[PDB]
């Protein structure tokens, strides 16, 4: 998922909404998210039960991460089982919540 040299996996910039009704990307943005040297898949145990993982990213940069649900329904259910019970993972009050940016995680606007 690069194509340059080496290390290019945190690039891009923000962008302005122009329409969305036949379209509903399902994106689960999850902040707040720890560092103690823990696999992917910790932050995707969050969201096996919840939903099929088309595709997810694990940013430790700015400690962020982006799991893209099979279903919006998946990922609508995680962010709000946040609201009623507090998301704790690998001991952390995480925050869940769903993100706009990116449909898929992919980036890759068609030519319409």
Not at 39 to 53: N, Q
């Amino acid at each position: 998922g690069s194509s340059g040299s080496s290390g290019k996996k945190p690039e891009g910039k923000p962008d302005q909404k122009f329409d969305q009704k036949q379209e509903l990307g399902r994106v689960i943005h999850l902040s707040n998210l720890p560092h103690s040297g823990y696999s992917d898949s910790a932050v995707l145990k969050l969201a096996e039960p919840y939903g099929k993982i088309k595709n997810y990213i694990l940013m430790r940069m700015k400690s962020q991460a982006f799991i893209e649900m099979e279903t919006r329904e998946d990922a609508m259910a995680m962010v709000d089982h946040c609201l009623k019970k507090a998301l704790w993972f690998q001991g952390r009050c995480v925050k869940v919540d769903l993100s706009e940016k990116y449909k898929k995680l992919v980036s890759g606007p068609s030519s319409g």
